[PDB]
Each structure stands twice: as structure tokens, then as C-alpha cells.
Swiss-Prot record, chain A:
Present with 450 molecules/cell in log phase SD medium. Component of the ribosome, a large ribonucleoprotein complex responsible for the synthesis of proteins in the cell. The small ribosomal subunit (SSU) binds messenger RNAs (mRNAs) and translates the encoded message by selecting cognate aminoacyl-transfer RNA (tRNA) molecules. The large subunit (LSU) contains the ribosomal catalytic site termed the peptidyl transferase center (PTC), which catalyzes the formation of peptide bonds, thereby polymerizing the amino acids delivered by tRNAs into a polypeptide chain. It comes from Saccharomyces cerevisiae (strain ATCC 204508 / S288c) (Baker's yeast). Belongs to the universal ribosomal protein uL3 family. Component of the large ribosomal subunit (LSU). Mature yeast ribosomes consist of a small (40S) and a large (60S) subunit. The 40S small subunit contains 1 molecule of ribosomal RNA (18S rRNA) and 33 different proteins (encoded by 57 genes). The large 60S subunit contains 3 rRNA molecules (25S, 5.8S and 5S rRNA) and 46 different proteins (encoded by 81 genes). uL3 forms together with ES39L one of the contact sites for the signal recognition particle that targets ribosomes to the endoplasmic reticulum membrane. This is Large ribosomal subunit protein uL3.
UniProtKB/Swiss-Prot annotation, chain B:
N-terminally acetylated by acetyltransferase NatA. Transmembrane segments: none annotated. This is Large ribosomal subunit protein uL13B. There are 2 genes for uL13 in yeast. The gene is RPL16B. Belongs to the universal ribosomal protein uL13 family. GO terms for cellular component: cytosol; cytosolic large ribosomal subunit; nucleolus; ribosome. Keywords: Acetylation, Cytoplasm, Isopeptide bond, Phosphoprotein, Ribonucleoprotein, Ribosomal protein, Ubl conjugation. Component of the ribosome, a large ribonucleoprotein complex responsible for the synthesis of proteins in the cell. The small ribosomal subunit (SSU) binds messenger RNAs (mRNAs) and translates the encoded message by selecting cognate aminoacyl-transfer RNA (tRNA) molecules. The large subunit (LSU) contains the ribosomal catalytic site termed the peptidyl transferase center (PTC), which catalyzes the formation of peptide bonds, thereby polymerizing the amino acids delivered by tRNAs into a polypeptide chain. The modification N-acetylserine is found at residue 1. One of its GO terms (molecular function) is RNA binding. The lineage of its organism: Eukaryota, Fungi, Dikarya, Ascomycota, Saccharomycotina. Its main location: cytoplasm. It comes from Saccharomyces cerevisiae (strain ATCC 204508 / S288c). The modification Phosphoserine is found at residues 42, 180, 184, 186.
From Swiss-Prot, chain D:
There are 2 genes for uL14 in yeast. This is Large ribosomal subunit protein uL14A. The modification N-acetylserine is found at residue 1. Component of the large ribosomal subunit (LSU). Mature yeast ribosomes consist of a small (40S) and a large (60S) subunit. The 40S small subunit contains 1 molecule of ribosomal RNA (18S rRNA) and 33 different proteins (encoded by 57 genes). The large 60S subunit contains 3 rRNA molecules (25S, 5.8S and 5S rRNA) and 46 different proteins (encoded by 81 genes). GO terms for cellular component: cytosol; cytosolic large ribosomal subunit. The lineage of its organism: Eukaryota, Fungi, Dikarya, Ascomycota, Saccharomycotina. One of its GO terms (biological process) is cytoplasmic translation. GO terms for molecular function: large ribosomal subunit rRNA binding; structural constituent of ribosome. Component of the ribosome, a large ribonucleoprotein complex responsible for the synthesis of proteins in the cell. The small ribosomal subunit (SSU) binds messenger RNAs (mRNAs) and translates the encoded message by selecting cognate aminoacyl-transfer RNA (tRNA) molecules. The large subunit (LSU) contains the ribosomal catalytic site termed the peptidyl transferase center (PTC), which catalyzes the formation of peptide bonds, thereby polymerizing the amino acids delivered by tRNAs into a polypeptide chain. It comes from the Eukaryota. InterPro entries: Ribosomal_uL14 (IPR000218), Ribosomal_uL14_CS (IPR019972), Ribosomal_uL14_sf (IPR036853).
Curated annotation (Swiss-Prot), chain F:
It comes from Saccharomyces cerevisiae (strain ATCC 204508 / S288c) (Baker's yeast). GO terms for cellular component: cytosol; cytosolic large ribosomal subunit. Coiled coil: none annotated. Keywords: Cytoplasm, Ribonucleoprotein, Ribosomal protein. Belongs to the universal ribosomal protein uL6 family. GO terms for biological process: cytoplasmic translation. Component of the large ribosomal subunit (LSU). Mature yeast ribosomes consist of a small (40S) and a large (60S) subunit. The 40S small subunit contains 1 molecule of ribosomal RNA (18S rRNA) and 33 different proteins (encoded by 57 genes). The large 60S subunit contains 3 rRNA molecules (25S, 5.8S and 5S rRNA) and 46 different proteins (encoded by 81 genes). uL6 lines the binding pocket for eukaryotic elongation factor 2 (eEF2). One of its GO terms (molecular function) is rRNA binding. Pfam families: Ribosomal_L6 (PF00347). This is Large ribosomal subunit protein uL6A.
Length: 48, 197, 49, 136, 52, 189
RNA sequence: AGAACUGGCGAUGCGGGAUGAACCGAACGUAGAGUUAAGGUGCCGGAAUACACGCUCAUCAGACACCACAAAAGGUGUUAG
RNA sequence: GCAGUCAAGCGUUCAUAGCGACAUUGCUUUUUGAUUCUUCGAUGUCGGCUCUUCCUAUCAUACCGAAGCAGAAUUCGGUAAGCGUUGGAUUGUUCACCCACUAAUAGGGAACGUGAGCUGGGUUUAGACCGUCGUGAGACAGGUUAGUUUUACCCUACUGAU
């Protein structure tokens, strides 16, 4: 996680009062590089 | 008489097993009970369900982690019935209940080892034909078990891996009977037949 | 007297044992949680200026 | 809530609770309205109900035309001072809390509205919009 | 428009019944002994109301 | 009292062979074929002819014997359905609002949907059981015919229909609408 | 709460009724063998998952008197009459 | 306080849709009473505030049945206590009455829950005033006003923590 910001977008929720209107919403930004795979692990079913 | 006993629990009744187990294990015999999801119990399903839902009701109010631990697995329902029959609060009940090893399905070690049956608890012999009986897997699942669909996927592999063994053995011994039946017409056997062998 | 930012009557008598259900002080935060149905509004490219 | 409401509203910051004494814009002789209740307004222990813009209240006049006072009457609040948030983002507020006398069917008693009026009331109560001269 | 050749059919499943005075349960018109256990399989029945 | 022997018997018209092993009936015929499980009942079966079968219970005592004739009818209904077949003729009824019924292939199997059940918008669908064929009358276009071999499938499906096309929160003495069975017969006679 | 006759608890342990001042059995020197009381023999629990004729299957079964509760009225559920 | 059984009748006709007298069977311990076993080398005694949990004899909400159910609205009943069940004037009040919203404004228990948790309006010490009683000191379950509310660092429980 990094932090938050504020945006604007036109709506497509039809029949609402704010259809074809714009709004303001708050979003979180999360920094998200590439992970790298190093392994694989195998799980199997048991009665436990 | 054998050092360890392996009890197939199919078509058995719970409280009529556990009074044999709880005495044979208090007298010094090691017992394992296997295929406990195939156990049977008197009474209709709804009735034996309510007799569990009136157990889940009983938990220590001020903190329920202190109270009656309602186990949902058949291996543990049977153990409950036995723990009740045993003075588990002493070093004799404790020592006994460590002579016991209960399972669902038949794991490998007790797969290739012979199984037995307690006739004074078989539903077949005991119960009237026409009475309703309830199966512990359906019950456990209905009160919050999870691993029913696994045991059936494993025990079937057990069965198809066992049926081939049985066919192998049978198609071996049908000739042992022939080559010992071809050898029973001598004096060695006409003399034993008088002794009773 | 003896505080206001608290609870009175943490329990009645004969249960005689304070309950798991009653409000009591302790840690706040550093708990694990899973919120759901969070929509995505942009998936970001790092090589873009 | 829908006792005369044409449409349905968004949540607005609940400004003025009961006990509030807000002006009266209409030309019905009144001067202030004492809120005694709110339509909607669910229950919680020790919580006193509140009124937002566009909400109906039930009210009691304290100053104006003794023909009116000493009785309850429905009312409609059309300005409030609590900064509230519009979906377009901005926080707006008025300089005074003010209301209107009304009947349960959402109609009015007066012929005008002395002052500005909130879009969040006027879209909803249509008989207020026809008698308003200004909207925000 | 129900054409009473068919109104008779709808009434076989709706209004040709008998009701317990003790549990208010739909029972058939020919039967005694309310099938529900909470009543005690009683015999106090009546016909269902069809005229006024 | 506990009796000694209560036995019923089951005729068998030709073309039919009734195979039993461990209380699992299997019947065949011109129309088709059928099976049934009766492990939950204690009952025997013997073959005195290819033309009939003898079913028997022993001491019993007034509870097993009531299931005896029941079993007898079940097997007899089965033979009847695999020799002739069953036909259930349901019919529509309404006052103002017609019921618009059709068959529809959903993602899985067939269904039968009904619309305008008293002006409702809920398109209420019903599965078709596997043992059922299904059609509409043509002499009058306001019926429907379920049909098959197994009555406990056909009739259960018809009841599944007329149980969902039932009005709620209204006077049923007045709102005698929906669909209802009208005739039970076969598809040979 | 208050009287009559007797037996007890009090002042009395012991085996049984899970537990209990009074109930059942039975009254106590220290010990050993045998036999029983009342109560019990699925397991906890020592002792028959004994034998026999039947009744009951309860979606709040029922199970050691005192004792720790249960009625009027009903049921084609079943059994016998 | 709650419920049930007969059912004479009410119920435009229609005992039992709903109700239902004369009688009669019980349940409850949230009433009041009776009793006096425990507690007088002290179990802190009204109400409210706060807070949790439980019960069902369900006010509402869910699915159903029945009506003297056309619809709408209502009543009777059932499974069901999962979820909720208010803001305020007057009163110390329990209790009560009204205004108002509401889906609804249901009843009850937990040492008549809860005072080392609060308050201390009331009651129940001492000061004082009136009325009535009494020769008088003084009485009143009659009214009025003012009147010290102590301690947890222990064990357990609980919340969190190594
Ligand atoms: Zn009934």
C-alpha cells in the first residue's frame, strides 16, 4: 500500500439520479511490482 | 488373544461396541477401530441429530473454550462414548485410552492387516428387521464434518487395490487345494482322518 | 467517580464469571481483515510516463 | 418518508436535531419552527432524531400568527448550515437553517419562499420548486 | 370467464376440503383423524366455507 | 398379533420379464424398461410361472402387511407403465390473465416456463424429469399432457407445476386460477 | 402450626438409595475364612450383552419406593378385550 | 397472571369464523399473601444511568394455514426468540398518562441482575416548619427543606500480553 487519492468519473449506472453525471470518489493506490516465482509446493487431501 | 486387534466398525452399534472396547482395553488389550464412518446407531436420523443439537447447546457460557468440546468426527464421537465408559480422570483410564487408536477409513498399516468383527454389537444380529438406523457419516456431516467426500475417494482405491489381491490369492489357492487334494489319498491322510484332521 | 470512559455492569451476579461477550479493554488494531468487492479503476504500468 | 416525496434522496449530513428552531421562509406569517420529530428516523437508545435538507419534519411554531401556533404541522427544511457533501465533491452550506410549512401530501401553504433553496430538496418536493424563485 | 365445467376442477383442490376445529389444517372431506400429530389425531372437523 | 404368512400375487402379461435379485426389481416391455429399489422392506418373491409372481411376508404384524399390498401395487403400476404408459392431462384456468406456457432448453435439460400467472413478472420455470415426454393438446389448445412410464415421475412433475402456480395472500375461494390435472389414463388405451 | 401410639435422628458410624441428620438393611472390640441382607450384574462398577411369555419406537421415549412432581379431556397409533 | 375441557347461547340462518356463560382440570413464580429454615460478632436496602446474556406466554420482520377473507384492511392459529423493540413533557418514582416518530414501539428473568460500577432525587439518624393528637416530654407508614456514599496492590474470572 502507498496511499490514497481523489478522482472524477462519469457514471454509467442507468436510471440513477447521477447517470451521465460525474462524481468524486476516493481510491487507494497499491504499489505492485512484478513478483518472482522461486518454487512450487504440492498439497494433498487427507481426512485431517 | 492377539497383541493388537483391528476392528472393522461397519454395521456395528456404537454403545455396544464401546462396552466391549472399554473393557478389553482396560484389561490390557490394544485395539484400533477402523472404518468408523460406516458405524451405525439406533434410531432415526432426525432423532439422533437432535440428540446432538441438544449437545451443542451445552457450552460454558462465560467462555466456551472451557466447555464441552463438541467433536464432529465419528472417530471422536466413538471416543466420547468410550471416555464416558472409562475413568479417564485417572492414570488407569488415561493408560487405557492410549491403548486405543481410532480412524476413519482404513489407512495402509491396518490395510494389509486382518480385521475382525464384534458380533454382540452387529446391527444385523441385535436390531429387529424393520427398525430404522442412522449412519454416522451422514450424521457427522450434518453437524459439521467436512471430510466425507475424501474418505470415499480413498477407501475406494483401497477396495480396488484389495480386490485384485483377493483374486490373486484365490487363483493361487484353488491349485493348492488341488495339489493337496491330489495328495490326500495316501496312508498319511487316511491315518490322520482317524485322528480327526 | 473512578472514571467515565468505561463500562459499568460488566456482568451480573450468579454467572459469577465475567463473560467473553462483554466489552473490555485491550489491543486495538494490528488485526487481520479481508474487505471484499473493491473495484479496480486503473491497473498501472510503470514504464509509462 | 415517502409521504409526498416524488423521488428518493441521497444521504445528507444530518444537521439539525429536534429542539432546533429554524426560520420559516414561506409567506404564511410564521417566523420560526420548532422541530419535534422527523419522518424516517429510526431508533437507537438515547439518540435523538435529526433532519437533513429535503427531509420532512413535524413542527411547532413559536412566533407568528396565533391561528397557526399551539399545534403541530408538517414542514420541509430547505436550508441548513451543516456543510454537506455533494457527489460532485464540493461541500456547501447555507447561512441559516430554514424551512417551510406543508401538508402531509407534500404540498405547501404559502405562495413563495423568501430565500434560496436546495437542489436536494427541490428536485424531490416538486411543489416547492414551483414556489421557489432561487435554487442554490 | 371460468366456464363452470372447469370451476368444479379448481374447487376440488381449493374448496372441497375439511378443516380441523383444533389446528386449522386442510384435510380431505371424507377423512376423520387430522393427520398432524400436534392435534392428537382428533376427530373434530368441519367443512370449509363456500357460501356466504 | 403376529401372523404366519400374508402373501399377495402379481399377474404378468406377456412381453414382460421381471428380474429380482436382492429386492431390486427390473421390468421390461414394449414401451421401455424400469427398475426399483426395495431394500427398506422385508419381503420375498417367488416364481410359480412366467405368468405371475408371488410376494410374501411372514409374521409381520399389521405394519409389514400394509406395505405388502403397497409393494404389490408399485410393481403393478410399474408393469402397467412399461406395458401401456401413463398420461396426465392438465388444464389451464383463469379469469382475466392468461397463462403463457412453453418449453425451453436452458443450460442443462428442458424446462417448462409459465408467464402472466395473474399478471406476475416472475417467469417461473420447472424442470422436466428424465422419464417424461410432454406435449400440448390440439383438439383444444388450453391443456397440456405429461406422459411416460413412471407414474411417480409424471404425477410428481404435474404436482410440481400446480404447486408453484398457486396464488398467495388472496382468497382462494375466489381466485380459482392456475392449472390442475383433469384426467389420468394411459397412452395405449 | 398443633396433639395421640410406636420407631428413629439427636447422641450413630457401616453396605444400599449417585449425593442427603432421619428412608431400606443393619447397629460397631482388633483380625482371618465362609454366607447373606437391602441394592444390583452392558461399561464407568465387583457380579449373567443370562433364560422365558409379551407391550412399546416417542421431531420434549422411558428407566431404584421415601424422591425431588404432573392432571381434566382426547387419538382408528397399536395390543388385548 | 396464563391456558385448557364440556358448550346454554350470542353470532341476520348458522354452538365452536370469532366469542362463549353454569361448572370443571391445571400451569406459572415477573403480584400480593402465608410461613420463619438461613443470615442480627452486619450478605450495603427504592429508582434511574450503563452493559451483557437468557426465556417465550411473538409487538414487529420471514414462510404458512383459517375467516363472517372479493380487493384493501383486519382478527384466530402454527413453526420460529435469528434480528429489532424508540425520542420526549409531568412525576424521586416503580407504576401510570399524554405528544410524536416508527416496521414495531411485546412481556419477563439473572440475590425483586447491576452502589469496592455511578448517581443519591426518595426512603431511614441527628437541625428545623405546619396541620391533627397528647396535659406534657413527644407521635404520625401526613406534607416541606437541608443533610460525609470509604478501600482493591491479593486469588479466580474476563480482556489483552510474554
Ligand atoms: Zn388437527
Amino acid at each position: 500500500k502507498a496511499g490514497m487519492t481523489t478522482i472524477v468519473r462519469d457514471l454509467d449506472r442507468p436510471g440513477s439520479k447521477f447517470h451521465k453525471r460525474e462524481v468524486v470518489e476516493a481510491v487507494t493506490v497499491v504499489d505492485t511490482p512484478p513478483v518472482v516465482v522461486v518454487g512450487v509446493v504440492g498439497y494433498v487431501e487427507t481426512p485431517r | 488373544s492377539q497383541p493388537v486387534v483391528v476392528i472393522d466398525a461397519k454395521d456395528h452399534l456404537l454403545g455396544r461396541l464401546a462396552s466391549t472396547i472399554a473393557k478389553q482395553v482396560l484389561n490390557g488389550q490394544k485395539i484400533v477401530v477402523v472404518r468408523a464412518e460406516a458405524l451405525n446407531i439406533s434410531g432415526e436420523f432426525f432423532r439422533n441429530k437432535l440428540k446432538y443439537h441438544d449437545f451443542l447447546r451445552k457450552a460454558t457460557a462465560f467462555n466456551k473454550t472451557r466447555g464441552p468440546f463438541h467433536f464432529r468426527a465419528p472417530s471422536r464421537i466413538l471416543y466420547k462414548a468410550i471416555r464416558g465408559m472409562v475413568s479417564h480422570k485417572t492414570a488407569r483410564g488415561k493408560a487405557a485410552l492410549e491403548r486405543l487408536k481410532i480412524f476413519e477409513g482404513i489407512p495402509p498399516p491396518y490395510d494389509k492387516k486382518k480385521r475382525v468383527v464384534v458380533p454382540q454389537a452387529l446391527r444385523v444380529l441385535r436390531l429387529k428387521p424393520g427398525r430404522k438406523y442412522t449412519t454416522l457419516g451422514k450424521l457427522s456431516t450434518s453437524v459439521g464434518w467436512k471430510y466425507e467426500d475424501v474418505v470415499a475417494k480413498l477407501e475406494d482405491k483401497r477396495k480396488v487395490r484389495s480386490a485384485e489381491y483377493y483374486a490373486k490369492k484365490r487363483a493361487f489357492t484353488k491349485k493348492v487345494s488341488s495339489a493337496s487334494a491330489a495328495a490326500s489319498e495316501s496312508d498319511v491322510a487316511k491315518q490322520l482322518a482317524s485322528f480327526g484332521y | 467517580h473512578r472514571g467515565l470512559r468505561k463500562v459499568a455492569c460488566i456482568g451480573a451476579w450468579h454467572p459469577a464469571h465475567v463473560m467473553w461477550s462483554v466489552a473490555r479493554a485491550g489491543q486495538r488494531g494490528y488485526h487481520s481483515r479481508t474487505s471484499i468487492n473493491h473495484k479496480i479503476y486503473r491497473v498501472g504500468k510503470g514504464d509509462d510516463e | 418518508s415517502g409521504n409526498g416525496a416524488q423521488g428518493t434522496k441521497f444521504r445528507i449530513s444530518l444537521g439539525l436535531p429536534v429542539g432546533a428552531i429554524m426560520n420559516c421562509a414561506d409567506n404564511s406569517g410564521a417566523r420560526n419552527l420548532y422541530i419535534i420529530a422527523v419522518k424516517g428516523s429510526g431508533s437507537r437508545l438515547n439518540r435523538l432524531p435529526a433532519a437533513s435538507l429535503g427531509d420532512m419534519v413535524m413542527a411547532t411554531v413559536k412566533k407568528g400568527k396565533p391561528e397557526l401556533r399551539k399545534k403541530v404541522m408538517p414542514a420541509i427544511v430547505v436550508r441548513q448550515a451543516k456543510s454537506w457533501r455533494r457527489r460532485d465533491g464540493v461541500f456547501l452550506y447555507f447561512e441559516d437553517n430554514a424551512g417551510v410549512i406543508a401538508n402531509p401530501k407534500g404540498e405547501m401553504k404559502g405562495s413563495a419562499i423568501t430565500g434560496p433553496v436546495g437542489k436536494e430538496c427541490a428536485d424531490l418536493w416538486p411543489r416547492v420548486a414551483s414556489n421557489s424563485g432561487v435554487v442554490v | 370467464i371460468i366456464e363452470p365445467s372447469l370451476k368444479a376442477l379448481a374447487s376440488k383442490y381449493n374448496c372441497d376440503k375439511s378443516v380441523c376445529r383444533k389446528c386449522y389444517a386442510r384435510l380431505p372431506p371424507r377423512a376423520t383423524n387430522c393427520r398432524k400429530r400436534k392435534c392428537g389425531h382428533t376427530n373434530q372437523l368441519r367443512p370449509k366455507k363456500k357460501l356466504k | 398379533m403376529k401372523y404366519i404368512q400374508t402373501e399377495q400375487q402379481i399377474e404378468v402379461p406377456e412381453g414382460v420379464t421381471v428380474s429380482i435379485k436382492s429386492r431390486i426389481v427390473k421390468v421390461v416391455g414394449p414401451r421401455g424398461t424400469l427398475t426399483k429399489n426395495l431394500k427398506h422392506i422385508d419381503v420375498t418373491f417367488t416364481k410359480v410361472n412366467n405368468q405371475l409372481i408371488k410376494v410374501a411376508v411372514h409374521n409381520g404384524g399389521r405394519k409389514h402387511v400394509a406395505a405388502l399390498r403397497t409393494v404389490k401395487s408399485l410393481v403393478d403400476n410399474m408393469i402397467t407403465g412399461v406395458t401401456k404408459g401413463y398420461k396426465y392431462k392438465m388444464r389451464y384456468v383463469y379469469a382475466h390473465f392468461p397463462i403463457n406456457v412453453n418449453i425451453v432448453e436452458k443450460d442443462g435439460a428442458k424446462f417448462i416456463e409459465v408467464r402472466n400467472f395473474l399478471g406476475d413478472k416472475k417467469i417461473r420455470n420447472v424442470p422436466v424429469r428424465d422419464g417424461v415426454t410432454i406435449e400440448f393438446s390440439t383438439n383444444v389448445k388450453d391443456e397440456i399432457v405429461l406422459s411416460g412410464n413412471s407414474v411417480e415421475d409424471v404425477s410428481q412433475n404435474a404436482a410440481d407445476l400446480q404447486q408453484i402456480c398457486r396464488v398467495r395472500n388472496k382468497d382462494i375461494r375466489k381466485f380459482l386460477d392456475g392449472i390442475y390435472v383433469s384426467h389420468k389414463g394411459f397412452i395405449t388405451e
